[PDB]
Design a protein around this ligand. Structure first.
Ligand SMILES: Cc1ncc(C[n+]2csc(CCOP(=O)(O)OP(=O)(O)O)c2C)c(N)n1
Ligand SMILES: Cc1ncc(C[n+]2csc(CCOP(=O)(O)OP(=O)(O)O)c2C)c(N)n1
Ligand SMILES: [Mg+2]
Ligand SMILES: [Mg+2]
Lengths: 662, 662
């Protein structure tokens, strides 16, 4: 089944990778040299992709390189596979504006399914991808219409498996019995600092079986047929995700192979030549042997065209027999939402009072009926975040159609899975936990933002108002945390109507993650029209109550502190002080507006400003200005009843009024 | 060995806990009711503590409740054990200013060894504690002087074990063979949202054995003797940390026992009465039966006094035979550092150029000789963070005296272990990774800060200057992230001399974590005296170069951008513009100074300001002011050579000069 042309293919990967790195004078040659055999077997016998259609074929197999530092191998593969990655591209590895960056970047490079620099996330995202395949398979497949049916592959190293987030994801994958997920593990006994025997001596196989994965060992990781048999067995075990440990020699060909020294640095002109001797490789730099492009053409490209063409035909039939179903399938993939979100969403009257977690919960139930692609869940906090999708089932092996995901206490794993689910396509995801524990998943939000995924994060218990649970459960600095991440939108709704609006904007925003920051405690409805709140949230900031005539000043507030600002505006009127009250539910959305529009909300000539938010003042000087005052909380909170914490940490009308008046 | 007085003790814990919660109308009764038997066996037969001396006995056994929501049980225990937690205290659970807060708070409550609200961290910190015991045991114990010899216990639930960070910590504990660590696992089949069978069906036992832990199952978790035998076996297995799974019924006594409904809410007057019926308990609320205080007095308190008194005598001898060793042991525990840090630390001349990661590395080697308590490591990045302690050994089971810790790719687990190590006492810890991956460990920094631990974080590759590794490895928002956490100090040194100074301040600061943010690339030495840099860093911000006479304006910069500001000051002189250049290596340290001192560095009357930092502008308006300009980076970076990234994202003299002049 494997021959010498195949081995020349392996060493084509090795050489493209090492030369790319050498020419860049930057990169990681160990992994390409160790893992080319596994990647070659996978890409030529086991990856159902069609590079002819880039990444548009929704039912292609998904490959993720979790060990993102093996980027050169990936580009090398991509090239030979027929993706739009050219030999010149390989020659521009790590160069300004190349499509071949130091770590893989989704959206940058034809054929790169995920941005995987940060370790552990790549495999955790694949878990996501596999979850979505399973969920959509069950939703939409019919007898004779396997419309969503494909494998998910992650290539991982020792790094990925030390990271906790990967443990969360494997635990969860194991539990959900993702039989179409296969992890290929470049097990080389080396990590960056040295031998894994200095830090990582656990029994991985056993750990994975304890999760409910199938474990397979490939003793000789350079044996192609053995790697091939292993994958065949992985696929045969469709009741369990499978991990294949493939014992490998890092940097094979280097004098330094089997040491950390080949992890992360170019080999150097003589190391390259040396590895080429070992490979008995006498082609010139950056050269594909004809037989190798021929072998890729036949094993990979021709087979991909024919798999997609078959899928396309079957899909024409599917559309004939199940018109309405096929329509939902396409709407899933294309992000269609009804024009009626505004009327679908609940609306709250001037006299209502609701916690924004609970307004969120009602938005979710209203939306779930009308947006069939939506699903999501909570990191064991659905019943406290209020993120149960009433009546819509539980996502589980026996019911993959269920729409409530039970992520468990796995914040980071959850965020990563969301990212994968979104990268996969076909649905809209949301996930929830406490705002204070956004710290556990921050690095995944980061990847949401970089990869431009409209993941929706629902983060409740947004402030010291939490009260009796105490400082560990009371956010202070987490708005700063999330707001500063580029390409995100963070909404902190001030009431029910703001919460519905933010959900609407979350669904309509498709090129960045939307983070909804919500309250435990009830908030009064802002005393103005639903139409005004919707337009104002769409803009990110707006005036809630203007001054009768000329403004003495302006209070700018978010979330639960908008209600405080309204109360202090009243109290301050009674002292001849007429203030504007602005809600700024999203700084990012606000700052994306026209100068003209921004100046109407926060007049540049008005200097007497006060900012009010239950969290750090860091950042607020931007809006408060030289002459403003910053009402916020620059210390940890306390275990006490809610109203007491708020009072003691200065979220009160008295304190706001007093501060304005000095 | 166990009798009916003992069971009355168990149900004393149950009842104190549930009544405390009931009276608070807030708390988590399931775990106290399920886990009282394990906690009772542990505290009365297996916890060598002496509450008579609060938490001053350095060689006491360390108990951590990782499942921090079982706080009421802990207070209940603390009370009966003789800690300074009174019955009135129990009656003030979750009340403003009580010493009995909703989750346990180190420093708040006599007997509480760690702040454990955030799940997974409690056990991860115990791993820390156990690491320090092992390390100091090996450093200081001698024949007939077991001066550091004690167990570490963590009580965990299903939550702790789903979190990735706990996986990092168990992996690592397993590898380090922490035979004195015992984890007690309240395995009740319930998590907050419902049954663990909806999310968490893994084989925990097997997972732990794969880490190299010993696993023991206590089938009937209410059997005291069986829990006792199990702990005895755990201790007998001193080659492996041990986890004891103790099968339990959550909320035992409630009509709702064995369901999630008893997880997190008071039982309600009738649930309490019901559980008291089941327990056949007819004492009034908040009452300890005499036989129970008697049994605690004898099993726990009397035995603790005698263990400490014996230890104190042995320690008087130890001090006689090994005077110099005993002196170091006490200096470890009391944080003594030489007066000569200033001369111990390396110093750099006006013509030198060094990357601050590399200045950091030289500070570490210089300090390690002189500060015997220092140790630390890297999350598999020592060779890239430059945090190898030259010649001082590797921390490993065969060499626990080694001072380089190999944490592996376990950022969060590492931070948590650092926290534990610091809580334990006796050493100064540092740990390192890339600044961009501070996101992985943010939640532990948070706990460093809350618990007031002078943990030292060494976070390198601080900016887009990283270059070819690309956006996933280039920090943008991480200064904001860390600066906004209350009670931390974040230093971003602008050169070698600033880096030594910051290390000095890090060692002298004992009540908060110190975070050192360091460069990959070389930085020129600031053109001023070492003495001036030391005083200026001690103050957090200072003028590097004043204006000849009257200042046209001021550039305020940090880290690598101080050198840019100096170059632009030159370039701007040549256009009749004389500017002040301020280095602000720590905002927090700066803002802790006198108004008077702050005004000398950044004159309030000087309005033409520019701030320059390679990261988000968020926050900077505070210093830039209404009329200032903010030079920073509010987008993800790129894979390109270093100088190109800096240039393209506007970290350049040209761009600084141009911005000043419009
Ligand atoms: C989260 C995270 N932490 C640290 C790094 C830096 N890093 C890149 S690869 C690696 C170590 C992993 O070595 P392994 O995965 O075994 O790769 P090999 O050297 O085996 O190719 C590290 C620490 C990272 N990329 N992401
Ligand atoms: C990091 C983190 N995420 C979420 C929570 C909220 N929370 C507290 S306990 C818990 C679930 C754990 O249930 P388990 O540990 O099994 O406790 P039991 O209900 O068994 O007492 C959750 C999600 C938390 N405290 N910390
Ligand atoms: Mg490796
Ligand atoms: Mg439980």
């Amino acid at each position: 089944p494997y021959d010498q042309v195949d081995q020349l293919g392996v060493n084509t990967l090795r050489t493209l990778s090492i030369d790319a790195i050498q020419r860049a004078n930057s990169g990681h040659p160990g992994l390409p040299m160790g893992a080319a055999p596994m990647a070659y077997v996978l890409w030529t016998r086991h990856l159902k992709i069609n590079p002819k259609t880039h990444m548009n074929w929704v039912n292609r197999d998904r490959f993720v390189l979790s060990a993102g530092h093996g980027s050169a191998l990936l580009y090398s593969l991509a090239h030979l596979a027929g993706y739009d990655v050219s030999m010149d591209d390989l020659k521009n590895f790590r160069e300004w504006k190349s499509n071949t960056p130091g770590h893989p970047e989704y959206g940058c490079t034809d054929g790169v399914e995920a941005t995987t620099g940060p370790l552990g996330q790549g495999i955790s995202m694949a878990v996501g991808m596999a979850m979505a395949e399973a969920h959509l398979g069950k939703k939409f497949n019919r007898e004779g219409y396997p419309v969503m049916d494909h494998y998910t592959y992650a290539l991982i190293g020792d790094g990925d498996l030390m990271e906790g987030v990967a443990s969360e994801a494997a635990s969860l994958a194991g539990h959900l019995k993702l039989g179409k997920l296969i992890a290929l593990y470049d097990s080389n006994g080396i990590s960056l600092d040295g031998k894994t025997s200095a830090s990582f001596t656990e029994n991985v196989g056993a750990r994975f079986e304890a999760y409910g994965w199938q474990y397979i060992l490939v003793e000789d990781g350079f044996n192609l047929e053995e790697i091939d048999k292993a994958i065949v067995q992985a696929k045969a075990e469709s009741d369990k995700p499978t991990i294949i440990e493939i014992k490998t020699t890092i940097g094979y060909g280097s004098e330094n192979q089997g040491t950390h020294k080949v992890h992360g640095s170019p080999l150097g002109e003589e190391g390259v030549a040396h590895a080429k001797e070992v490979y008995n490789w006498n082609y010139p730099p950056f050269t594909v042997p004809e037989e190798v492009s021929q072998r890729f053409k036949e094993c990979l490209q021709d087979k991909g065209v024919k798999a997609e063409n078959k899928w396309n035909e079957m899909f024409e039939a599917y559309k004939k027999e199940y018109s309405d179903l096929a329509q939902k399938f396409s709407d899933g993939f294309s992000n269609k939402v009804p024009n009626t979100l505004g009327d679908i969403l609940p609306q709250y009257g001037e006299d209502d009072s609701i916690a924004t977690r609970a307004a969120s919960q009602k938005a979710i139930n209203a939306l779930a009926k009308e947006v069939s692609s939506l699903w999501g869940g909570a990191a064991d906090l659905a019943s406290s975040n209020k993120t149960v999708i009433a009546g819509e089932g539980d996502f589980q092996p026996e019911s993959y159609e269920g729409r409530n995901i039970w992520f468990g206490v796995r914040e980071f794993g959850m965020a990563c899975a969301m990212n994968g689910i979104m990268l996969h396509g076909g649905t809209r995801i949301f996930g929830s936990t406490f705002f204070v524990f956004s710290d556990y998943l921050k690095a995944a939000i980061r990847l949401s933002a970089i990869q431009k995924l409209p993941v929706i994060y629902v983060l409740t218990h947004d402030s010291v108002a939490v009260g009796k649970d105490g400082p560990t459960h009371e956010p202070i600095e987490q708005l700063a945390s999330l707001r500063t991440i580029p390409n995100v939108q963070v909404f902190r709704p001030a009431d029910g109507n703001e919460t519905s609006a933010a959900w609407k904007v979350a669904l309509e925003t498709l090129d960045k993650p939307t983070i909804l920051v919500l309250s435990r405690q009830n908030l009064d409805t802002l005393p103005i029209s639903k139409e005004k709140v919707f337009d104002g949230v769409e803009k990110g900031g707006y005036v809630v109550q203007g001054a009768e005539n000329e403004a003495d000043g302006i209070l700018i507030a978010t979330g639960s502190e908008v209600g405080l600002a309204l109360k202090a505006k009243e109290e301050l009127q009674k002292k001849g002080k007429d203030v504007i009250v602005v809600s700024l539910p999203s700084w990012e959305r606000f700052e994306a507006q026209s100068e003209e529009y921004k100046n109407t909300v926060i007049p540049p000539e008005l200097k007497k400003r006060m900012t009010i938010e239950a969290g750090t003042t860091y950042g607020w000087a931007k809006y408060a200005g030289d002459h403003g005052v910053m009402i916020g909380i620059d210390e940890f909170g306390m275990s006490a009843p809610s109203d007491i914490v708020l009072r003691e940490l200065g979220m009160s009308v008295e304190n706001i009024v007093d501060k304005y008046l000095e």
